[PDB]
Amino acid sequence: ASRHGQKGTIGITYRREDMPFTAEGIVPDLIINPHAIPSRMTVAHLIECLLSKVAALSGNEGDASPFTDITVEGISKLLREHGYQSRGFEVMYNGHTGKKLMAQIFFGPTYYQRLRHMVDDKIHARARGPMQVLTRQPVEGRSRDGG
């Protein structure tokens, strides 16, 4: 999950050669769906991605405090000075064919947390197993091979 309530599980993993790449050879660590943005209105996610890109380029640290006078306009100007599109878009190329993607991709660093919920601690199946002594029904819980 990001720091804006944008939780999600890994759908699939692609190796580097299959990921989309920019003209500089940079490939994303993560790809998230655009459709997560409009309904949830997590603008701070986008602003933080832009600020992180600027900070990584310039070597400073982005001041993402809430009620400061930091605007997307200034971050965009700083990003433009560094030689990138001011709004964070980058011309990417499809990994499979190497062709330019007709649409430009929002691209940049973002801080993500690994949450404690892993699938290997949740997967559980039971054909037959221990039965409860009273009701002669399957026991409860995956720690007990329950049903």
Binding site: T9, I123, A125, R126, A127, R128, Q137, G147
Partner: protein, 56 residues
Amino acid sequence: RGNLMGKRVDFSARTVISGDPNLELDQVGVPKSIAKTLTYPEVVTPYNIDRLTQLV
């Protein structure tokens, strides 16, 4: 309510779900470990003697 209208059952699995645009509408992807755990009893018939013997 707790043991007659609804009760814990065997031959059931549970886990996290993921999307797959490459699966049909009526298809479900099943982990190999779960498929190896859950079982179905097939009666031995002249029509399925060979494959059941192979599975055994």
